[PDB]
Design a protein around this ligand. Sequence first.
Ligand SMILES: *[C@@H]1O[C@H](CO)[C@@H](O[C@@H]2O[C@H](CO)[C@@H](O[C@@H]3O[C@H](CO)[C@@H](O)[C@H](O[C@H]4O[C@H](CO)[C@@H](O)[C@H](O)[C@@H]4O)[C@@H]3O)[C@H](O)[C@H]2NC(C)=O)[C@H](O)[C@H]1NC(C)=O
Ligand SMILES: *[C@@H]1O[C@H](CO)[C@@H](O[C@@H]2O[C@H](CO)[C@@H](O[C@@H]3O[C@H](CO)[C@@H](O)[C@H](O[C@H]4O[C@H](CO)[C@@H](O)[C@H](O)[C@@H]4O)[C@@H]3O)[C@H](O)[C@H]2NC(C)=O)[C@H](O)[C@H]1NC(C)=O
Ligand SMILES: *[C@@H]1O[C@H](CO)[C@@H](O[C@@H]2O[C@H](CO)[C@@H](O[C@@H]3O[C@H](CO)[C@@H](O)[C@H](O[C@H]4O[C@H](CO)[C@@H](O)[C@H](O)[C@@H]4O)[C@@H]3O)[C@H](O)[C@H]2NC(C)=O)[C@H](O)[C@H]1NC(C)=O
Ligand SMILES: CC(C)[C@H](C)[C@@H](O)[C@H](O)[C@@H](C)[C@H]1CC[C@H]2[C@@H]3COC(=O)[C@H]4C[C@H](O)[C@H](O)C[C@]4(C)[C@H]3CC[C@]12C
Ligand SMILES: *[C@@H]1O[C@H](CO)[C@@H](O)[C@H](O)[C@H]1NC(C)=O
Ligand SMILES: *[C@@H]1O[C@H](CO)[C@@H](O)[C@H](O)[C@H]1NC(C)=O
Ligand SMILES: *[C@@H]1O[C@H](CO)[C@@H](O)[C@H](O)[C@H]1NC(C)=O
Length: 741
Amino acid sequence: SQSLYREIHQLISFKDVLPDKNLLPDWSSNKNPCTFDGVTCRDDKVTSIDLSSKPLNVGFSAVSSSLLSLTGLESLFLSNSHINGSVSGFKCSASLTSLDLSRNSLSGPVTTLTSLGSCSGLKFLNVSSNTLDFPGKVSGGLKLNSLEVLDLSANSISGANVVGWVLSDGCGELKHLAISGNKISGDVDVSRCVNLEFLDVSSNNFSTGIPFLGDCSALQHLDISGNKLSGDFSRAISTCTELKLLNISSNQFVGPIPPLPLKSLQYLSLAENKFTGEIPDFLSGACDTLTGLDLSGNHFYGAVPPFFGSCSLLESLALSSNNFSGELPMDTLLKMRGLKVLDLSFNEFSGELPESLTNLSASLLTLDLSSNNFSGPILPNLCQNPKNTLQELYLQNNGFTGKIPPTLSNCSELVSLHLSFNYLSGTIPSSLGSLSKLRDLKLWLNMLEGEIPQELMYVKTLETLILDFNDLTGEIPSGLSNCTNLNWISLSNNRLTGEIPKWIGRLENLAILKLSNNSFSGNIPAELGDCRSLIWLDLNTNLFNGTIPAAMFKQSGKIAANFIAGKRYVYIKNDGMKKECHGAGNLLEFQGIRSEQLNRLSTRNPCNSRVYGGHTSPTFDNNGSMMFLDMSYNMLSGYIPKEIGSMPYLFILNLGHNDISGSIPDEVGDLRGLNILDLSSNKLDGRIPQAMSALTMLTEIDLSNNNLSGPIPEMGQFETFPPAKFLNNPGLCGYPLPRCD
Ligand SMILES: *[C@@H]1O[C@H](CO)[C@@H](O[C@@H]2O[C@H](CO)[C@@H](O[C@@H]3O[C@H](CO)[C@@H](O)[C@H](O[C@H]4O[C@H](CO)[C@@H](O)[C@H](O)[C@@H]4O)[C@@H]3O)[C@H](O)[C@H]2NC(C)=O)[C@H](O)[C@H]1NC(C)=O
Ligand SMILES: *[C@@H]1O[C@H](CO)[C@@H](O[C@@H]2O[C@H](CO)[C@@H](O[C@@H]3O[C@H](CO)[C@@H](O)[C@H](O[C@H]4O[C@H](CO)[C@@H](O)[C@H](O)[C@@H]4O)[C@@H]3O)[C@H](O)[C@H]2NC(C)=O)[C@H](O)[C@H]1NC(C)=O
Ligand SMILES: *[C@@H]1O[C@H](CO)[C@@H](O[C@@H]2O[C@H](CO)[C@@H](O[C@@H]3O[C@H](CO)[C@@H](O)[C@H](O[C@H]4O[C@H](CO)[C@@H](O)[C@H](O)[C@@H]4O)[C@@H]3O)[C@H](O)[C@H]2NC(C)=O)[C@H](O)[C@H]1NC(C)=O
Ligand SMILES: CC(C)[C@H](C)[C@@H](O)[C@H](O)[C@@H](C)[C@H]1CC[C@H]2[C@@H]3COC(=O)[C@H]4C[C@H](O)[C@H](O)C[C@]4(C)[C@H]3CC[C@]12C
Ligand SMILES: *[C@@H]1O[C@H](CO)[C@@H](O)[C@H](O)[C@H]1NC(C)=O
Ligand SMILES: *[C@@H]1O[C@H](CO)[C@@H](O)[C@H](O)[C@H]1NC(C)=O
Ligand SMILES: *[C@@H]1O[C@H](CO)[C@@H](O)[C@H](O)[C@H]1NC(C)=O
């Protein structure tokens, strides 16, 4: 036929306008398209093309002129294909049924989509994750009332009543509307959409009316979360008898949990609102269908109603960040046959752990009991039940006394263990080396003694070791050389000894090494310079000596950090007020702990009030450098190597209280991101290099107690700092000091 001749010529003309033609290397003229990678054929005719996740790097016009006009094409999938430009009028084949253009760079007003009406058979349209917008006045209509599925999520659509604009010309055919991740406001009226099954209007700018749903005859999925809605949603969804998922989380709802349609309900989320009072007895009505419940981050209180035993289908129960109290209602949890995730974190549950809990170790994937008021010992008999499935165990920030049960090694599926912030004595059981899947061992702020288990080598998956604030002794176990995935090692405020092993250079994933306030010694390993993920080095308050190896900076400009991101931390800034408190500040892991309990450190730390929190976020993804370097309060000597200046992402530099001599390298002036510079109490001499006048981001400097001399630089930021920062430098003069003689 002709369409065959035309099919091949159209496909090859498309290939030919690609900047990287090597992308469709098996496409070629005088070959049958049905043999082409990306092509679906039925009876020797093209019915579908899928060029998704290939960087085609061409514009929509190339697509609509070559591809969308092919006779018989039924579906075109071009998600994440680097298509830019915008939709305009074109001839479209009547067979085309699905168009997926999601995750591209389509730009322009959302009114451009209206020109896709050329496609008389189009029923499914995904244009999510682009940059389509709605400039100014919202008038007219989208005019695609034949659609069954429309996805406009994650665009740049800012406007009021955009939904009415979408639905203006009719929605009798519409089954699934998603438009989340925009900035849409106003009214949502889908009452004329009597076949609508799926509505996601989440993460927008709604702060007035609740969506109006009319008879709600077909609605199964309703997501209005992530807005600023308040008011009577109970009445709005009261006609909704087929509802399976109701997500109203992250809004401004207040009062008690009101009546709900439970007979079909599988997923319910009320999280992150201002609901008050206690879980009502009437929710037992969903115990026949309910698979997921989330009431986290409200003001709920009291106990977990006993009715939950009937919710035998309930897989996840999340109630964290309320004020639930009482003992672990094991009598109810043991009936929830299907329970997999249990999250009661950040409440005020109390008492010891009931012995019956050891049964759930054979069904649960996650047990999150962090930040409560539990007391007593960790159940030794825990994970007796053969085939222990438990993956995550979070018991941090409670009142647990006793030893760490070696029995925990039987929970062989364990990926995450967090026993921090308790009162645990005894040693770190050697048997934890048996947890072949463990990624996180977090035991910080307890009273753990003895040495760090050599047997920890037997854990190949290990990524984080957080042992700060204990009573550990002995040296860094040579065995740890084996855990090559470590990206965060924190051993501060113990009584460790020995040197820093030279095998640290081995771990190419280590991003944070914190060894402060112990008794480590010897020289700084030039081997640290071999770590290619290292961004935070805190060796303060120890007994290291020798000279700062220039080699430790060899990685600067090559540093990659990706795995360390997204982890909750607190950074506690040192105010130079108390002389017993050392270092720039303490970076501490802080997943599942209340800041209100930082006061617990008072007895272990001479530091008093300045707490930064967040989630780790490197300032680059690649080609970075160290961001933090503290070696204060040691016995280092010799001169600062000029390579010190080679780290453009360095925010903090503390080398204070050592025996460093010679003169401040002029390369410090290259450290353009520097916020803090402490070189106090050393033996540095010569002149403050004028180059340092180029630093623009210094919020703090200290050069006091050296043998520096000559004039303080008048340009840059020096005039900004008080005299104290320069005291005890005999030959030093110039404002803020007395003028030079
Ligand atoms: C409009 O297009 C968007 C963008 O593609 C689309 O959203 C994305 O959908 C996909 C699935 O269709 C999501 O990817 C999933 O992510 C989950 C984790 O959250 C994974 O578990 C899933 O993996 C499963 O399936 C894979 C094969 O697809 C298997 O390899 C794997 O083993 C699992 O079985 C899956 O990868 C994606 O997260 C969303 N979100 C994005 C990218 O924004 C959206 O659904 C489209 N809209 C409509 C109406 O179709
Ligand atoms: C019930 O609803 C809640 C609340 O909406 C929901 O949890 C949320 O999931 C969404 C994903 O749909 C999360 O949103 C993302 O947050 C991450 C992390 O900060 C961001 O990186 C993401 O930004 C991207 O996507 C945006 C579009 O949504 C884009 O505009 C942006 O440019 C980025 O590409 C995104 O915002 C959100 O973090 C959570 N919220 C909370 C509080 O957990 C939950 O999953 C729902 N439950 C069920 C089962 O449906
Ligand atoms: C490096 O490690 C060591 C080991 O922790 C650390 O020494 C400890 O410092 C803390 C905090 O200063 C000390 O805690 C004190 O304990 C005594 C009793 O032994 C108490 O009397 C003290 O109480 C005072 O402060 C309280 C509030 O914090 C007040 O309520 C009270 O009225 C008192 O004023 C205080 O809690 C602890 O004794 C030492 N332990 C050791 C081993 O010496 C050291 O400070 C760390 N170094 C650095 C640089 O951080
Ligand atoms: C990359 C991570 C490991 C890291 C924790 C990161 O996520 C985090 O944002 C870091 C970069 C933060 C945590 C503490 C922050 C510092 C807080 O303490 C310092 O006093 C302030 C003072 C002042 O505000 C300066 O502008 C920056 C400055 C000095 C901050 C520099 C950036 C931080 C160091
Ligand atoms: C589309 O992307 C290409 C590649 O960068 C560019 O040359 C062209 O100008 C872009 N078109 C639009 C509309 O931005
Ligand atoms: C959300 O809507 C309000 C009211 O229309 C508007 O004033 C505001 O600009 C919008 N906020 C955002 C974050 O765009
Ligand atoms: C939370 O519950 C506890 C224990 O019953 C109660 O004493 C406390 O007042 C509650 N917290 C608040 C602030 O309501």
